[PDB]
Coordinates of C-alpha atoms and ligand atoms in Angstrom, one line a residue:
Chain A
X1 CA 0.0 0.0 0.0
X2 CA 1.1 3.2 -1.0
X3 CA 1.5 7.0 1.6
X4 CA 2.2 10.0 0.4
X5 CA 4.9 12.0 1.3
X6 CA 6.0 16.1 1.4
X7 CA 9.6 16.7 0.8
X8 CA 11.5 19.9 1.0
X9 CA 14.8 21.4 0.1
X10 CA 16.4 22.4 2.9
X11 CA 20.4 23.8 2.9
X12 CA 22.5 20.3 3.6
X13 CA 19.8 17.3 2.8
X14 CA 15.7 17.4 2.5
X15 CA 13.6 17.2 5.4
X16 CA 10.1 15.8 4.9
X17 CA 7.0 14.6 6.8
X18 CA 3.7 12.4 6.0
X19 CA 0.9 15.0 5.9
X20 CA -1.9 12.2 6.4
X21 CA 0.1 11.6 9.5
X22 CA 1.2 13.8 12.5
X23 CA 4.5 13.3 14.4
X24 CA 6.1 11.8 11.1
X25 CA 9.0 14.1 10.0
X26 CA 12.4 12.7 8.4
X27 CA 15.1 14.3 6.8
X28 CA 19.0 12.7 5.3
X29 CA 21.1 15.0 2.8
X30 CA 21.0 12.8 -0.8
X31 CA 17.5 12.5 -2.4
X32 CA 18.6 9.0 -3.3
X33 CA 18.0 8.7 1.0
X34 CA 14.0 9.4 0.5
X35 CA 12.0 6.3 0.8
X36 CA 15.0 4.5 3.2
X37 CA 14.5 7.3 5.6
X38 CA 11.1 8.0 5.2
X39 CA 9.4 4.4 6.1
X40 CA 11.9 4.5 9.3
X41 CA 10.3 7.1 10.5
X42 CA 7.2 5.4 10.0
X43 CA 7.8 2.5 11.6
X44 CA 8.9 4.1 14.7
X45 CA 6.3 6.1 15.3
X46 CA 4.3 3.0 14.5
X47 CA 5.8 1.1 16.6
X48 CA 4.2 2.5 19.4
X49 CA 1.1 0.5 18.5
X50 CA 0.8 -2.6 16.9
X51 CA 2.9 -4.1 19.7
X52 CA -0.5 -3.0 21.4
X53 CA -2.3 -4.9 17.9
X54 CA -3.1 -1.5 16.4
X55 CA -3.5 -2.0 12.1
X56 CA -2.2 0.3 9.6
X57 CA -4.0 2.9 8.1
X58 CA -5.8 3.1 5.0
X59 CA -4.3 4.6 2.1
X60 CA -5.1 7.5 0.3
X61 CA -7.9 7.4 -3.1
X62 CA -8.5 10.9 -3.9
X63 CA -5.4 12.5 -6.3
X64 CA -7.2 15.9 -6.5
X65 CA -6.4 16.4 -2.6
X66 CA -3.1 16.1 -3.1
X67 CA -2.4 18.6 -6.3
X68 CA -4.5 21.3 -4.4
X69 CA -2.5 21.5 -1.6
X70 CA -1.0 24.8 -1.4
X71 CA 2.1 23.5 0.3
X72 CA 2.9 21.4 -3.3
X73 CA 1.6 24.6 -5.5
X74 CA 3.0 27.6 -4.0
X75 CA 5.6 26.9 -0.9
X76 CA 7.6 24.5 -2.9
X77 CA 7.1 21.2 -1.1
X78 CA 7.2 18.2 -3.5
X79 CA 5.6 14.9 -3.6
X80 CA 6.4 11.7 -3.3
X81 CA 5.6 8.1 -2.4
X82 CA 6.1 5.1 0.3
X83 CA 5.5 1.5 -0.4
X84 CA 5.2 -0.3 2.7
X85 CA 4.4 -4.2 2.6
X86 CA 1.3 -5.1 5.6
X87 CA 2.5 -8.4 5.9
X88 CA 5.8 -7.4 7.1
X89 CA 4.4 -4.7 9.8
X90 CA 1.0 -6.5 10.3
X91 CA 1.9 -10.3 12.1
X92 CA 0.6 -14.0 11.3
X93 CA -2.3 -14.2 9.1
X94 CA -5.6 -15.4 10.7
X95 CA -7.9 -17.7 8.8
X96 CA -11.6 -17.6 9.9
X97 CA -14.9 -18.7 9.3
X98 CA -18.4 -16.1 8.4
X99 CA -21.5 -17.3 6.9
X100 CA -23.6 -15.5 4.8
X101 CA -26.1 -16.1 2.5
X102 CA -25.7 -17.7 -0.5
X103 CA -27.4 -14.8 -2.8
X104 CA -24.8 -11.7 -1.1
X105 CA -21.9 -14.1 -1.7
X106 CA -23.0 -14.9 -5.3
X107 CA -23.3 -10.8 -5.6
X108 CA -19.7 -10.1 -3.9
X109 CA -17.9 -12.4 -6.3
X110 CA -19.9 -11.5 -9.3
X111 CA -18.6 -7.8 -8.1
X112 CA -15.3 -8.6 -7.6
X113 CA -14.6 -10.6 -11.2
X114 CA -15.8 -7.2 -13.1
X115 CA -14.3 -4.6 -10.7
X116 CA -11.0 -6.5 -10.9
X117 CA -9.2 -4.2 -8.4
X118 CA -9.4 -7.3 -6.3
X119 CA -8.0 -10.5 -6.4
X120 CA -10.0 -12.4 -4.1
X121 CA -12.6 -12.0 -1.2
X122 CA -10.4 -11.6 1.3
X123 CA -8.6 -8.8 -0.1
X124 CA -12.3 -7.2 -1.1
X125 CA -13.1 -7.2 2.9
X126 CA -9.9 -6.4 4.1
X127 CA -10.1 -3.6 2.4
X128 CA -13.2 -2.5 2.7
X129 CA -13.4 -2.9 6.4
X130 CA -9.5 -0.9 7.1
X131 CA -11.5 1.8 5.9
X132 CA -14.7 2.0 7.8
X133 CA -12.0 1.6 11.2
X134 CA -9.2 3.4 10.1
X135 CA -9.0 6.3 7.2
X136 CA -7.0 8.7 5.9
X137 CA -10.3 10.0 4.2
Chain B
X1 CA -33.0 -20.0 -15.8
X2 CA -33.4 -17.6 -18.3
X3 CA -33.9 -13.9 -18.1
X4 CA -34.1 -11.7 -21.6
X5 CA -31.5 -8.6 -22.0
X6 CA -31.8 -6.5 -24.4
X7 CA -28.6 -5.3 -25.5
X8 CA -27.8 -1.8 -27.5
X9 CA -24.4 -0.7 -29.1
X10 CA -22.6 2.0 -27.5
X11 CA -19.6 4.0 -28.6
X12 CA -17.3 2.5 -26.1
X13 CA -18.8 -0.8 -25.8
X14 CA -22.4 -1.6 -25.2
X15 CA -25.1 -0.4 -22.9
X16 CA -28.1 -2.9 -21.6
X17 CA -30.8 -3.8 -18.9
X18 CA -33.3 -6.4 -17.8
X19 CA -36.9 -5.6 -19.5
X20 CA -38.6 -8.3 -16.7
X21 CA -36.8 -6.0 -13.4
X22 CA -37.5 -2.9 -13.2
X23 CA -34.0 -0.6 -12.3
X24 CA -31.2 -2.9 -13.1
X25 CA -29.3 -1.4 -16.0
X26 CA -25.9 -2.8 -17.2
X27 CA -23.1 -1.4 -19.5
X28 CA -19.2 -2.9 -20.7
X29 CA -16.4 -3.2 -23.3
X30 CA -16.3 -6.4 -24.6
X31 CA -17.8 -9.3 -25.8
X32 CA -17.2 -11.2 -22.5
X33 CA -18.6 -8.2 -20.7
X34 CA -21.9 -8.8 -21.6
X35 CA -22.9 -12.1 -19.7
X36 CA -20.8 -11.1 -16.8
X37 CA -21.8 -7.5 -16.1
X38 CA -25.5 -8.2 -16.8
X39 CA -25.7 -11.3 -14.4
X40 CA -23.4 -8.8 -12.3
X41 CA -26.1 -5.8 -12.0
X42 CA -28.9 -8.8 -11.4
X43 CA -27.0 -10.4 -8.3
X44 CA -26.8 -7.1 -7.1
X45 CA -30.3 -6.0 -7.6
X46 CA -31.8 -8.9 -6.3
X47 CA -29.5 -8.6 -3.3
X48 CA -30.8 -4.8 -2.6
X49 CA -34.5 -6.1 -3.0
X50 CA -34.3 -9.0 -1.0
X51 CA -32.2 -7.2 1.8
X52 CA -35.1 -4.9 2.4
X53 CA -37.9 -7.9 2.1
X54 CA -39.0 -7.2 -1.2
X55 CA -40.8 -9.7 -3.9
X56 CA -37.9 -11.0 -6.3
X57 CA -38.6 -10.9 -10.2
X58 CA -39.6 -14.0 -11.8
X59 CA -38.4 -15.3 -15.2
X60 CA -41.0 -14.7 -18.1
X61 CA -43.1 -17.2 -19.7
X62 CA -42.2 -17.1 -23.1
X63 CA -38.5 -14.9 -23.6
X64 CA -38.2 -15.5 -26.8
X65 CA -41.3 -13.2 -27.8
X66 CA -39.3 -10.0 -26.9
X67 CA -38.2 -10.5 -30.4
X68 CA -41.3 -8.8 -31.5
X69 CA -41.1 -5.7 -28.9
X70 CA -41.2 -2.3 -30.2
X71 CA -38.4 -0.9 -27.8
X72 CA -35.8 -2.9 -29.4
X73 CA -36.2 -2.4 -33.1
X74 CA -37.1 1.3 -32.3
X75 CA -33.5 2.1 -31.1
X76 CA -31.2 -0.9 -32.5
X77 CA -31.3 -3.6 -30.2
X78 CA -30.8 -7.2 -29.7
X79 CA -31.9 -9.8 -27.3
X80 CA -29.9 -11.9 -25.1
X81 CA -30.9 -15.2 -23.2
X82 CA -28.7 -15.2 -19.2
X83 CA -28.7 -18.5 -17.6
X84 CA -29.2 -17.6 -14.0
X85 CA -28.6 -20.3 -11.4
X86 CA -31.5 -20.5 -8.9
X87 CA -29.3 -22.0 -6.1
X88 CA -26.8 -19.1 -6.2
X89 CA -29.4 -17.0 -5.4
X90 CA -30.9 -18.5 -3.0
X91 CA -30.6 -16.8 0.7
X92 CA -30.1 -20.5 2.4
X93 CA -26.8 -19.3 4.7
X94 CA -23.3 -20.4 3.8
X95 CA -20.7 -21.1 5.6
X96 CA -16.9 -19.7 4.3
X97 CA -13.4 -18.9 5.1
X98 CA -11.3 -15.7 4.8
X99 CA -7.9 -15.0 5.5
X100 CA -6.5 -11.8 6.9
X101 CA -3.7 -10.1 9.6
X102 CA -3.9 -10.6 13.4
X103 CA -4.3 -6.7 13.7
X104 CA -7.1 -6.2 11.5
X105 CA -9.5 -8.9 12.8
X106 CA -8.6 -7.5 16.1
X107 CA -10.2 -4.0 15.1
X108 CA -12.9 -5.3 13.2
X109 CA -13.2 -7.3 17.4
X110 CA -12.8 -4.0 19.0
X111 CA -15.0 -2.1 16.5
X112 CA -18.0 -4.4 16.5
X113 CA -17.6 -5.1 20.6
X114 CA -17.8 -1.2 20.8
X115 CA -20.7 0.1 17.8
X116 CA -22.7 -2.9 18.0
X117 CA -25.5 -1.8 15.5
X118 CA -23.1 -4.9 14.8
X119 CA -23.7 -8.2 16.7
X120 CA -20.4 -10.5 14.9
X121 CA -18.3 -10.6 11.9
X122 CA -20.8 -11.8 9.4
X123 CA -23.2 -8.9 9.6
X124 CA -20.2 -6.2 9.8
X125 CA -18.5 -7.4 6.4
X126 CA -22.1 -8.2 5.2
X127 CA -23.6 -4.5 6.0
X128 CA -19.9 -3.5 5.3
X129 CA -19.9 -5.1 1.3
X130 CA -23.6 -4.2 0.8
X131 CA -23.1 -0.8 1.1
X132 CA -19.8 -1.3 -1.5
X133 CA -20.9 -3.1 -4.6
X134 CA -24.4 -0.3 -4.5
X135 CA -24.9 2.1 -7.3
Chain C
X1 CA -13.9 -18.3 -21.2
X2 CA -17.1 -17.3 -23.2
X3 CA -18.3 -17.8 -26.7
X4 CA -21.0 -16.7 -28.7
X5 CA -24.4 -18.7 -29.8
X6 CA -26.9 -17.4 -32.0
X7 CA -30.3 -19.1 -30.4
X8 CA -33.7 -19.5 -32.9
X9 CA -37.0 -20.2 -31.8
X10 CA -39.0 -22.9 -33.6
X11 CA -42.0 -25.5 -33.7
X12 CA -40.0 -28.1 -31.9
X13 CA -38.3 -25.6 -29.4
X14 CA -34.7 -24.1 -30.2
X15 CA -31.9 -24.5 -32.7
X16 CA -28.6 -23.1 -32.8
X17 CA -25.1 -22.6 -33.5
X18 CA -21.8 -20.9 -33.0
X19 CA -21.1 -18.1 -35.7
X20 CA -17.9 -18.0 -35.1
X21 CA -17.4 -21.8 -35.9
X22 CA -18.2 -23.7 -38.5
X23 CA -20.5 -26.1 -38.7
X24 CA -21.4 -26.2 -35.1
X25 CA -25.0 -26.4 -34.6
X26 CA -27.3 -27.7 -31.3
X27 CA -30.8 -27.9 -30.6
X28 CA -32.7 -28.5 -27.5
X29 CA -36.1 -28.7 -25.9
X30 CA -36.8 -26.5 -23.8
X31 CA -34.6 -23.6 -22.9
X32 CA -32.8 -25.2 -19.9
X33 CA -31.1 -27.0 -22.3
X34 CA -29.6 -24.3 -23.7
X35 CA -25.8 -23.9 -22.0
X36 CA -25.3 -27.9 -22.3
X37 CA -26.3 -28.8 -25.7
X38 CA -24.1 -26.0 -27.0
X39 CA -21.3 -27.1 -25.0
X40 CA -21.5 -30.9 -26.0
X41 CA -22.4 -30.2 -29.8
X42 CA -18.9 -28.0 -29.3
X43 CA -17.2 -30.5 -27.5
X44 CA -17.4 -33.2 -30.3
X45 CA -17.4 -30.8 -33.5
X46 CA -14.1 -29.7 -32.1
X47 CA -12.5 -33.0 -30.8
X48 CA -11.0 -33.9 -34.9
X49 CA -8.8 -30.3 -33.9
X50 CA -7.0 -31.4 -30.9
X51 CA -5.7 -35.0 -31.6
X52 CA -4.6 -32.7 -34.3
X53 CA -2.7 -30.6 -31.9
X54 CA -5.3 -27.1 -32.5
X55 CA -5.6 -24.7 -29.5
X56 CA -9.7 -23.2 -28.8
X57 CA -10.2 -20.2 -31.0
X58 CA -10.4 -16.9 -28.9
X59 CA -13.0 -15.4 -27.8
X60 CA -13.8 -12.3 -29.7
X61 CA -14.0 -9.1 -28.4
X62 CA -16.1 -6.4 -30.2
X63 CA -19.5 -6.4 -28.9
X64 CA -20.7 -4.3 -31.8
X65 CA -19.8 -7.0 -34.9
X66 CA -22.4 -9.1 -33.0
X67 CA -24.8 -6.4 -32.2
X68 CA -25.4 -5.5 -35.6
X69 CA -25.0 -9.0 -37.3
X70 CA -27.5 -9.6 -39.7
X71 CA -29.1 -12.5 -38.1
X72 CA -29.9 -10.8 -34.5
X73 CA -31.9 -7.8 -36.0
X74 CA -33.4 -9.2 -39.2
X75 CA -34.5 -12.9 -38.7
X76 CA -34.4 -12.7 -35.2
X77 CA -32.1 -14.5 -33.6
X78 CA -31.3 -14.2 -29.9
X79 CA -27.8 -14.1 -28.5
X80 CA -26.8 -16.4 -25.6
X81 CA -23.1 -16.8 -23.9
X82 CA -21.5 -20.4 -23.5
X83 CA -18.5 -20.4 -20.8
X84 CA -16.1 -22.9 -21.7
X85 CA -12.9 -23.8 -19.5
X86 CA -9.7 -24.3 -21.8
X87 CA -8.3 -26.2 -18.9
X88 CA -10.1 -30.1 -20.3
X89 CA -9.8 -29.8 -23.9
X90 CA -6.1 -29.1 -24.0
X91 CA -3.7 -31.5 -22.4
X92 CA -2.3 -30.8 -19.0
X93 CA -0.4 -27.7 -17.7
X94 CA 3.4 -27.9 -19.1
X95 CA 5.9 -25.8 -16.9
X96 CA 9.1 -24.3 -19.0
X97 CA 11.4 -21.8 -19.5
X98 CA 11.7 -18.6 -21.2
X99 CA 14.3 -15.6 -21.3
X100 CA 13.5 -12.3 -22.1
X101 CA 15.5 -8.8 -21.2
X102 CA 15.1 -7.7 -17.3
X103 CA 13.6 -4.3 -18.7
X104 CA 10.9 -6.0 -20.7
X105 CA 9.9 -8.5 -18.0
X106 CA 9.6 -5.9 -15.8
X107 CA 7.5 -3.6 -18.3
X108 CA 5.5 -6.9 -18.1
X109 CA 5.1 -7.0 -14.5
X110 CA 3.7 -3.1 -14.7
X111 CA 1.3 -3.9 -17.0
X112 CA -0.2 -6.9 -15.4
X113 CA -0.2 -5.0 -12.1
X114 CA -1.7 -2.0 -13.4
X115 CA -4.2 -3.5 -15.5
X116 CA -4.9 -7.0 -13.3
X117 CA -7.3 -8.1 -15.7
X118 CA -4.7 -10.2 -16.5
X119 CA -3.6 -12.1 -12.8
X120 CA 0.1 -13.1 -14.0
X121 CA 2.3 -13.5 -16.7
X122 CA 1.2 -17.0 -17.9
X123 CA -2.1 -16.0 -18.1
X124 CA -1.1 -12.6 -19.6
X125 CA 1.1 -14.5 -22.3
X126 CA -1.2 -17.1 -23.2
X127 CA -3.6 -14.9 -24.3
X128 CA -1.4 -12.7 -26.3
X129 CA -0.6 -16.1 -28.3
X130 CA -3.9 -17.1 -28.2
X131 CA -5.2 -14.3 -30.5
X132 CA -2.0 -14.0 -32.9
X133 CA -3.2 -17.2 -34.1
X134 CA -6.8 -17.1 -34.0
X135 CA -8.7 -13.6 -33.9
X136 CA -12.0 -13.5 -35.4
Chain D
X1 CA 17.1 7.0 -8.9
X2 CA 15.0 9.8 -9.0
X3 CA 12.9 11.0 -11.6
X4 CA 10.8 14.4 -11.6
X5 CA 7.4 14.4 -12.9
X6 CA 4.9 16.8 -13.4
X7 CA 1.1 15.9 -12.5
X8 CA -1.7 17.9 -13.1
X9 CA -5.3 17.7 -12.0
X10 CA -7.4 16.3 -14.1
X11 CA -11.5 16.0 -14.4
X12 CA -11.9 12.5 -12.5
X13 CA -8.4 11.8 -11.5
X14 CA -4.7 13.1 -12.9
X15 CA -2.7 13.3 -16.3
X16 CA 0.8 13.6 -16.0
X17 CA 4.4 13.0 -18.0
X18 CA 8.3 13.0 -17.4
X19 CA 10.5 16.5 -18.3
X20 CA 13.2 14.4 -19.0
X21 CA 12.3 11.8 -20.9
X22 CA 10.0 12.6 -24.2
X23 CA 7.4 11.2 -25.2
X24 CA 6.9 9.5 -21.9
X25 CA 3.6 10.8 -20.3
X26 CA 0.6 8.9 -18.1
X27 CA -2.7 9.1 -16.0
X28 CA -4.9 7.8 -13.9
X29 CA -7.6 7.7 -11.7
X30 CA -6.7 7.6 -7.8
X31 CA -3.6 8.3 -5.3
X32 CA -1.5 4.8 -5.8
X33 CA -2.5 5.2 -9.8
X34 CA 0.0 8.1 -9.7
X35 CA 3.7 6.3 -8.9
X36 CA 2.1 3.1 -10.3
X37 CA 1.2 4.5 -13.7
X38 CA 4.5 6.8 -14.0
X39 CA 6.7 3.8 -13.2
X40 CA 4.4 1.7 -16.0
X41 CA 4.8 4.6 -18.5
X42 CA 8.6 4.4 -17.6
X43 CA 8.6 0.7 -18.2
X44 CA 7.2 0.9 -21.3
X45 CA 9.2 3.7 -23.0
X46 CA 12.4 2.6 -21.7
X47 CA 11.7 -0.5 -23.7
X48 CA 11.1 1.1 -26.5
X49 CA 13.6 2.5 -26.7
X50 CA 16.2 0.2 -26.0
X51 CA 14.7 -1.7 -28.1
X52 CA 15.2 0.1 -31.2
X53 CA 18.5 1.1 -29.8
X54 CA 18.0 4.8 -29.0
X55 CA 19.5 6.5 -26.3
X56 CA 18.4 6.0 -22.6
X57 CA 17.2 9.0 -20.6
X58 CA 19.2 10.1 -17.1
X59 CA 17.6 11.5 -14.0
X60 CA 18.7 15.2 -14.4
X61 CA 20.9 16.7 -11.9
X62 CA 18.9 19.0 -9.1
X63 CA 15.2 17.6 -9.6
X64 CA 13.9 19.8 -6.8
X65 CA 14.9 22.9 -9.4
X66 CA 11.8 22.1 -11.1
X67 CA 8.9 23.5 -8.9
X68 CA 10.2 26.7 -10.3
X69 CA 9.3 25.5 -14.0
X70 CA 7.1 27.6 -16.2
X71 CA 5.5 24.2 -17.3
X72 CA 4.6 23.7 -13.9
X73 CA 2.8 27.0 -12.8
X74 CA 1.5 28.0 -16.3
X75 CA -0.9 25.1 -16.1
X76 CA -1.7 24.2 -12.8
X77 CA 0.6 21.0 -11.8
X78 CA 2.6 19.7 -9.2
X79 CA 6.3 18.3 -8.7
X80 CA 6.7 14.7 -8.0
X81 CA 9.3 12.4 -7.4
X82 CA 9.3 8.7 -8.7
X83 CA 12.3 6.4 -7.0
X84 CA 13.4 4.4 -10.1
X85 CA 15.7 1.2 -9.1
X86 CA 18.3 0.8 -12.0
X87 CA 18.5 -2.9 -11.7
X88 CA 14.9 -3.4 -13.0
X89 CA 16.1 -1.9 -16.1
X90 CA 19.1 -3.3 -17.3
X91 CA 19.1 -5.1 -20.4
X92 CA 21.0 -8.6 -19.7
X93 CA 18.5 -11.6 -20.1
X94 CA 17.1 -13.4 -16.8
X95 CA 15.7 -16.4 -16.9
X96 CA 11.7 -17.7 -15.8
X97 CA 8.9 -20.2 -15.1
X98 CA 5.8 -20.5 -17.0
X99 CA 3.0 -22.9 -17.3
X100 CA 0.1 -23.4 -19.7
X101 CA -1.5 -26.7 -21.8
X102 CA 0.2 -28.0 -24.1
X103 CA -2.2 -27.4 -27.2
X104 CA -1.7 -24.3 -26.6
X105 CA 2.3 -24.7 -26.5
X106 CA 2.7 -26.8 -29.6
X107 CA 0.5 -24.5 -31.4
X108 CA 3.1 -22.1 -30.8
X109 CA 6.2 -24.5 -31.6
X110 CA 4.3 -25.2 -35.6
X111 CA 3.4 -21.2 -35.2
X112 CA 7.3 -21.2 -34.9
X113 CA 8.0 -23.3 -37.8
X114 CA 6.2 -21.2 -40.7
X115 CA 6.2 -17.2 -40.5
X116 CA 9.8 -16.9 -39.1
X117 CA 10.1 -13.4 -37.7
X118 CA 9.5 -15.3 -35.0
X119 CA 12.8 -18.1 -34.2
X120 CA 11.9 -18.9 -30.8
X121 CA 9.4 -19.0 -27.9
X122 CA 11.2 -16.3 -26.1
X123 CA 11.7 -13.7 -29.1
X124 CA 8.0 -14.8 -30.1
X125 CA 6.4 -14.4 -26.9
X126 CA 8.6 -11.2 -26.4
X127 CA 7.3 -10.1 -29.4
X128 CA 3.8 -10.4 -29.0
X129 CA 4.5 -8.9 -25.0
X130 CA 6.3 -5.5 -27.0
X131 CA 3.4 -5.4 -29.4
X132 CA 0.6 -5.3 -26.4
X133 CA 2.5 -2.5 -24.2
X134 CA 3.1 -0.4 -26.9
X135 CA -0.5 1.2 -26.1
Ligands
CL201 CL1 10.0 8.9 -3.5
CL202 CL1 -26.9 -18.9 -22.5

């Protein structure tokens, strides 16, 4: 899953911060140092939960957001992107048991082999239910 | 069983519905798109009517005579035959597995032991997907 | 994966045929018999092609060729969908080998990731074959 | 390695394309489309080129210079920055797994016995692959 990121200039390096997320900021002095630094300082801050069992946040949709903010159009902050793996901050996978009826399962996989931004159900109601918990909005 | 579509050319693709149930329009791309979006719109449809406890649609006597219906030579249509599977939409309860992280089945836990408009899981994804794969 | 039938009522009950191969026709009953007398009348009519070695034709993909074929708006003719698994028909899954530039495969990978209509790259390749040798 | 791009808002979603490399643009619909696509459009090209042996581009020297770009301001964008990794890229063969029937392979094997453009399964299926993307 994929968090954006503000980076900015600075005199020896870049410091930067995840605007979807306070208490986030990073720095380092070559932009090849970005992404390396970056996800560090999200997974310390992070750290602080899920040893409690907390989940990750859901990631961003909306682009427009993003190319509004005046902080990327007129005080010269730049974009740019963290790809962080769940299964390597969220633990052991948990396999469980629902029923529902037949006629709403029918409907979710019929849904989910013409949306195709899913590759099974579990995915489909993972994602749909890290959302209703925890946004980014 | 078999519910009539009629189906109607569309600059990117085609554009469709069901004439027997009433608001359950379809649209796609490509060939394959047709039986799989229109049987896509009716599971849906007949999930939203028989969630609230409303009669379902029944399959017509004779499909065939759409052939002769004014709405489809009128605009430049063509009929389709679905085969719809009776037991998939039956509402008979089924049982079925899903796998995801320690952490987020704990939340969906906390979440549900907290909001409880939500008795369990089942109803939470269930409420959860319905109001997802709407339109 | 799904082909198309052209479907005609009659006296006895329904006859039929896929346009897209020849000399495939079915007939039925009633119109519960539709979706497994087309796939067995296909099942033999195309059993000669693979002792012979033949891979299943491709399913076509313009939705408007059909819409507008002569036999669906004049002497009305109703268009019905068979699905038909490629996994029976053709012999077993083989596993190989294949090199291609780094670059390219990973211009693969984007794609398939970005358009996941796809799921990986045998399925992504086999269907690029598929329809270099068969089309219409 | 990094890689400016410019992205610009568009009606339902974003439009974007590369200052340093030409010809190279993208778009797309929601937040992860935006690396995703740029990389893809990045895949593509750079195989495109290489392929009919033109020049490679270079990430350009001070990439943060860009925010002050006329073609920045003068239509509305924003500066991004994709992380390339130059390994994914390089052009030395590698070596892979696939699997599917074997109707379907031996119709390739007498596909690769008549029209030969085509002298193997890898340049074949390569070819085929470059055809697709190109789009
Ligand atoms: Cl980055
Ligand atoms: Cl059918």
């Amino acid at each position: 899953m994929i968090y954006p990121i503000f980076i900015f200039k600075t005199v020896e390096g870049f410091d930067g911060y995840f605007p979807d997320i306070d208490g986030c900021f990073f720095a380092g002095n070559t932009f090849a140092d970005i992404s390396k630094n970056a996800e560090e300082a999200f997974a310390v801050h992070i750290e602080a939960l899920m040893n409690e069992g907390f989940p990750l946040p859901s990631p961003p949709k909306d682009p427009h957001r993003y190319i509004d903010d005046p902080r990327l159009k007129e005080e010269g902050g730049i974009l740019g992107f963290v790809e962080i793996d769940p299964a390597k901050y969220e633990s052991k996978a948990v396999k469980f048991n629902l029923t529902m009826s037949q006629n709403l399962l029918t409907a979710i996989d019929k849904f989910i082999a013409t949306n195709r931004g899913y590759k099974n159900r579990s995915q489909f109601l993972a994602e749909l239910a890290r959302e209703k918990i925890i946004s980014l909005e």
